[PDB]
Amino acid sequence: DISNVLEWIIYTTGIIFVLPLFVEIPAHLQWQCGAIAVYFYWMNFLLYLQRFENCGIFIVMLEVILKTLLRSTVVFIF
Amino acid sequence: HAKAVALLLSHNADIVLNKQQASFLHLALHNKRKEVVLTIIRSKRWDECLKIFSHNSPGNKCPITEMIEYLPECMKVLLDFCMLHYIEYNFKYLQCIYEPLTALNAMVQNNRIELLNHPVCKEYLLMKWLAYGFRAHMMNLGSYCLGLIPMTILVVNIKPGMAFNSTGIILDTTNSYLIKTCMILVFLSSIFGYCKDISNVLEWIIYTTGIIFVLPLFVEIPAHLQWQCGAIAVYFYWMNFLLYLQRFENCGIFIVMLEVILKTLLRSTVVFIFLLLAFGLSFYILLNLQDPFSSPLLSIIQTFSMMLGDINYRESFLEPYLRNELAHPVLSFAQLVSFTIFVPIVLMNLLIGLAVGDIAEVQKHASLKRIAMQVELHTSLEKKLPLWFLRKVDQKSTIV
Amino acid sequence: LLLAFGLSFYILLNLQDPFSSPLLSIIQTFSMMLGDINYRESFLEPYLRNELAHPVLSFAQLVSFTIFVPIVLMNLLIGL
Amino acid sequence: AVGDIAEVQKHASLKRIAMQVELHTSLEKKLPLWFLRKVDQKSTIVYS
Ligand SMILES: Cc1noc(Cn2c(=O)c3c(ncn3[C@@H](C)C(=O)Nc3cccc(-c4cnc(C(F)(F)F)nc4)n3)n(C)c2=O)n1
Ligand SMILES: Cc1noc(Cn2c(=O)c3c(ncn3[C@@H](C)C(=O)Nc3cccc(-c4cnc(C(F)(F)F)nc4)n3)n(C)c2=O)n1
């Protein structure tokens, strides 16, 4: 499932972002993981909004449009 | 049995109501008996059958309303008799506590666009327009313009950011008479507008900001506040003027479409604001060393600005990268590609498809919506006008 | 609609050449109706130089313009 | 995209109600029977 992959990435990158709570890490890696974590945190939040009356259909439409585009990029990439 | 009905009518049968307060015309209409209803209409006793009904019967209403609801073809046949070719249109069957424009309101409620497009109904609506509706709307529009036009004259004649009063531009007393006249007109329209829903909020903002704009007519205020309120007032003055244009034939449907598109967009911003937030915060982290992304709020505004295609690839991604000033360059380019895929393509195409569907749905019933707008305007006007004036201006027929 | 935004941009962005006159401001507003809003040259760079009188008003009007004309108005024309 | 949005809008209300039905059906399959019996109402009083 895509949602499981998204959540796994979120949790791993969030752990690495706040890792200096226990073990010191370089700032470059910390903020490189923080960018990924914040981006996927707010991207995966749209999946929680799909369980509301006013937001579910818009998320369904966004998924349909994105899947149609992705099935077509493998052609126009050439 | 139309022949049976004709034979019984030719023998002077009494038209009565049964224990359910229904006449034979009511029974024919509720059974959709087109032939016998046509026989009754073309009979020499049609006027007598028209008068037989009870005003307190819920099911057996006035036969004209029942005809509109059940047999609109018979209503069309009846209306064809009301236009006698110097064509004269008779509105005897078009109006009868009852709502104003009863027949036309029934036509609108029953989606009788073929009935509403009849020349008799068109002339009825035009008669009501030229009788009171055009005058009422023009008085309202002129009252609005009495503050809309002087404010625009003030804005385009005084340099923004400069304090001014009745004397002139604080001192440049050259256009002093025009400035004072426009200030007085704006003040009077704003206080009069206080003595006359989204529209009420818009008008309240307009009047308050217009008062503050021309406040130095009485009490001195700083130029910054004056022009800060003047910008708001002129913007909302010309934005709310579109609501006055909705009461015209050529402009109403476009305003309806604009409202539908705007509402559809606003119901969707509460969802894609989080997409914009994700991309803006990620760009804030990745492109922090650049002025457009130096703050979270500036980064979010920039991400909102590049949603139409102004991504600034060379200034923000290619030139910084070739200068080795891009921290996380692979991450920055990956997020650039993902943004381009998501917002300027997927999100914009989603909005475009939603708009196409909305416009198609509006255009499906454009003529019905237009005639319904006219009918609603005149019905609401009649409910507020005095009975003596309505009797004075009400025409029973129109000769063309 | 263009008159509403063009005159408001005239007051807010007066100190800039594209909005120095009421007529130039309306032509500029008509020109940014396709998406050439000039956000950096007209809103971001002047603001970071503290040359934007009414900076909160300008950014609020910039967001409202983008919502209205290049999105709602253009999609209305496309759907039509 | 226009075609996709039109196809989605064709069955928008059905898709919405189906989403609600699916959410509650999946929730009930995981909740304990005692809790479901505790919270289940047999009637509700309000006020081609
Ligand atoms: C389809 C579908 N799938 O699950 C459902 C669930 N679902 C409903 O949503 C729902 C409902 N009966 C009414 N309701 C709405 C009014 C209701 O509660 N709404 C509600 C509640 C809390 C928060 C929010 C809200 C909205 N928007 C945002 C956002 F920030 F994203 F903008 N945050 C929060 N909304 N049923 C039977 C249902 O299953 N519907
Ligand atoms: C729907 C609906 N809702 O209310 C109505 C009202 N309405 C009509 O408008 C109408 C009509 N019978 C003909 N008419 C038109 C031709 C008529 O008078 N038009 C007219 C009159 C004065 C000014 C303008 C005009 C147009 N455009 C602009 C703008 F600057 F915005 F471009 N300024 C001014 N137009 N009826 C029965 C009616 O109800 N129609």
Side-chain angles (χ1 to χ4, degrees), chain A, chain B residues 1-13 15-20 22-34 36-43 45-46 48-85 87-96 98 100-173 175-360 362-391 393-400, chain C, chain D residues 1-6 8-37 39-48:
Chain A
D1 215 9
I2 283 295
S3 202
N4 297 76
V5 173
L6 275 206
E7 298 240 358
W8 181 83
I9 296 169
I10 282 160
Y11 301 144
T12 324
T13 36
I15 290 266
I16 307 170
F17 181 60
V18 302
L19 216 42
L21 211 61
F22 302 111
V23 47
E24 184 223 307
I25 67 162
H28 187 262
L29 165 67
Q30 179 175 30
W31 278 100
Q32 173 184 52
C33 278
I36 302 171
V38 85
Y39 167 69
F40 281 112
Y41 249 123
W42 282 107
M43 272 294 246
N44 185 58
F45 187 60
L46 287 174
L47 296 189
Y48 289 79
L49 301 188
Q50 212 185 359
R51 321 258 43 91
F52 289 131
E53 245 183 8
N54 55 307
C55 311
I57 285 293
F58 181 99
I59 302 292
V60 164
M61 300 168 135
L62 189 85
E63 174 237 1
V64 170
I65 304 281
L66 184 69
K67 287 183 166 200
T68 307
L69 179 75
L70 288 184
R71 288 187 318 248
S72 96
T73 62
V74 292
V75 201
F76 80 61
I77 187 70
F78 301 112
Chain B
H1 310 295
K3 281 199 23 151
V5 164
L7 171 88
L8 270 165
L9 284 182
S10 314
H11 279 55
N12 302 334
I15 292 97
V16 296
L17 306 150
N18 66 21
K19 292 195 192 328
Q20 276 180 105
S23 72
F24 75 119
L25 178 56
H26 277 122
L27 262 60
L29 282 162
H30 297 183
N31 288 263
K32 306 193 159 180
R33 308 293 182 181
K34 196 191 94 175
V36 353
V37 166
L38 286 171
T39 275
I40 300 158
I41 275 162
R42 302 191 185 120
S43 165
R45 324 170 58 188
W46 156 243
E48 190 192 345
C49 309
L50 192 35
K51 277 160 192 34
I52 305 290
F53 64 99
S54 187
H55 291 295
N56 57 37
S57 293
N60 306 288
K61 295 158 280 125
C62 174
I64 300 279
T65 297
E66 313 275 54
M67 210 181 299
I68 291 161
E69 187 169 352
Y70 288 111
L71 287 155
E73 330 81 32
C74 302
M75 183 72 213
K76 195 212 164 299
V77 165
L78 187 61
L79 284 175
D80 282 333
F81 297 142
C82 282
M83 42 176 329
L84 317 151
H85 317 269
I87 315 182
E88 166 158 359
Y89 310 85
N90 223 282
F91 318 131
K92 28 160 162 192
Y93 309 132
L94 291 192
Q95 53 163 304
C96 230
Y98 278 111
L101 294 82
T102 341
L104 264 70
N105 271 297
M107 286 175 198
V108 168
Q109 279 147 24
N110 274 290
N111 288 52
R112 302 293 186 233
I113 182 54
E114 79 290 320
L115 273 187
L116 289 155
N117 274 326
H118 199 278
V120 175
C121 307
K122 281 198 28 73
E123 286 285 351
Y124 181 71
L125 259 187
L126 184 53
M127 166 259 146
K128 306 217 100 59
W129 186 234
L130 298 178
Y132 58 94
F134 176 76
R135 193 256 335 149
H137 185 236
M138 281 311 307
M139 297 297 112
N140 197 20
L141 195 133
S143 212
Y144 188 70
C145 289
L146 255 173
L148 169 84
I149 301 309
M151 176 105 189
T152 309
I153 286 163
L154 282 175
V155 162
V156 311
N157 276 122
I158 302 152
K159 169 102 169 181
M162 296 213 95
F164 65 96
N165 41 25
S166 357
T167 278
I169 294 138
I170 317 165
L171 251 177
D172 171 14
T173 107
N175 263 114
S176 41
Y177 179 66
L178 174 86
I179 295 174
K180 191 186 193 199
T181 303
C182 287
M183 266 165 99
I184 285 164
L185 283 181
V186 169
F187 176 80
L188 289 184
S189 60
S190 280
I191 60 178
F192 174 75
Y194 281 136
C195 322
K196 204 234 272 184
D197 211 13
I198 283 296
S199 202
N200 303 79
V201 172
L202 274 206
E203 299 239 357
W204 181 83
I205 296 170
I206 282 160
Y207 302 144
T208 324
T209 42
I211 288 267
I212 306 176
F213 183 58
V214 302
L215 219 37
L217 209 63
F218 302 111
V219 44
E220 184 221 307
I221 66 166
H224 186 261
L225 166 67
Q226 187 176 17
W227 278 100
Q228 169 180 13
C229 278
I232 301 167
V234 83
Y235 167 69
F236 281 112
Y237 249 123
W238 282 107
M239 275 294 249
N240 185 58
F241 187 60
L242 286 174
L243 295 189
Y244 289 79
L245 301 188
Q246 212 185 359
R247 321 258 43 91
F248 289 131
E249 245 183 8
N250 55 307
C251 312
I253 285 294
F254 181 99
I255 302 293
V256 164
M257 300 168 135
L258 190 84
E259 174 237 1
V260 170
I261 304 283
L262 184 69
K263 287 183 166 199
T264 308
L265 180 75
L266 288 185
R267 288 187 317 248
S268 96
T269 62
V270 292
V271 200
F272 80 61
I273 187 75
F274 302 111
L275 199 90
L276 289 184
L277 199 64
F279 276 110
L281 290 177
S282 208
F283 282 143
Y284 166 61
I285 293 165
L286 290 172
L287 309 176
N288 196 46
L289 288 212
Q290 308 175 9
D291 283 13
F293 308 85
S294 39
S295 298
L297 207 84
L298 285 190
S299 169
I300 292 154
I301 298 169
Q302 175 58 90
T303 302
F304 171 80
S305 294
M306 51 201 288
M307 90 160 310
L308 289 161
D310 214 336
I311 272 126
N312 294 100
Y313 162 74
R314 290 195 190 186
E315 314 97 281
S316 262
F317 294 93
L318 159 83
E319 296 166 16
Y321 162 71
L322 292 191
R323 288 184 318 245
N324 291 300
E325 274 151 26
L326 219 59
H328 322 105
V330 200
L331 226 46
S332 303
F333 275 103
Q335 186 87 333
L336 155 77
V337 166
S338 70
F339 175 87
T340 314
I341 277 167
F342 265 96
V343 186
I345 293 172
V346 161
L347 189 56
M348 287 321 294
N349 289 7
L350 210 173
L351 293 180
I352 286 176
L354 276 175
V356 167
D358 289 344
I359 298 292
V362 171
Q363 294 275 76
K364 232 167 285 293
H365 322 290
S367 38
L368 191 75
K369 183 64 160 78
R370 203 178 292 115
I371 297 173
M373 278 180 270
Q374 310 182 132
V375 167
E376 197 254 305
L377 164 87
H378 291 112
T379 301
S380 80
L381 255 177
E382 263 214 25
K383 288 179 182 193
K384 304 211 278 263
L385 289 191
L387 231 58
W388 69 266
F389 169 77
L390 290 174
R391 214 185 316 289
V393 297
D394 207 302
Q395 318 251 70
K396 312 300 191 49
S397 61
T398 269
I399 295 97
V400 163
Chain C
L1 198 87
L2 293 182
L3 202 63
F5 281 107
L7 289 176
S8 209
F9 281 143
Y10 166 61
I11 295 164
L12 291 172
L13 309 176
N14 196 46
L15 288 212
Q16 309 175 9
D17 284 15
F19 308 85
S20 40
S21 300
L23 205 83
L24 286 189
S25 177
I26 293 155
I27 299 168
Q28 173 60 90
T29 302
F30 171 80
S31 293
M32 52 199 292
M33 92 162 300
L34 290 161
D36 214 337
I37 273 127
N38 295 99
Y39 162 74
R40 289 194 191 187
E41 317 96 88
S42 262
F43 294 93
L44 159 82
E45 295 167 16
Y47 161 71
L48 293 190
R49 289 184 318 244
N50 289 300
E51 271 153 28
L52 219 58
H54 322 106
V56 197
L57 260 194
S58 306
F59 276 104
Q61 187 81 346
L62 153 78
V63 167
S64 71
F65 175 87
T66 314
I67 278 167
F68 265 97
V69 186
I71 294 172
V72 161
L73 188 56
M74 283 327 284
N75 290 7
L76 212 173
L77 295 179
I78 288 176
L80 272 176
Chain D
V2 167
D4 289 344
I5 298 291
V8 171
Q9 294 275 76
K10 231 167 286 292
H11 322 291
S13 38
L14 190 75
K15 183 64 161 77
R16 203 178 291 115
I17 297 173
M19 278 180 270
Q20 310 182 132
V21 167
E22 197 253 305
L23 164 87
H24 291 112
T25 301
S26 81
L27 253 176
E28 264 216 21
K29 289 180 184 196
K30 305 210 277 255
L31 289 193
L33 230 58
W34 69 266
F35 172 76
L36 290 173
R37 214 185 316 290
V39 298
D40 209 302
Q41 313 235 76
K42 319 291 197 52
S43 61
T44 266
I45 300 100
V46 157
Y47 309 146
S48 179

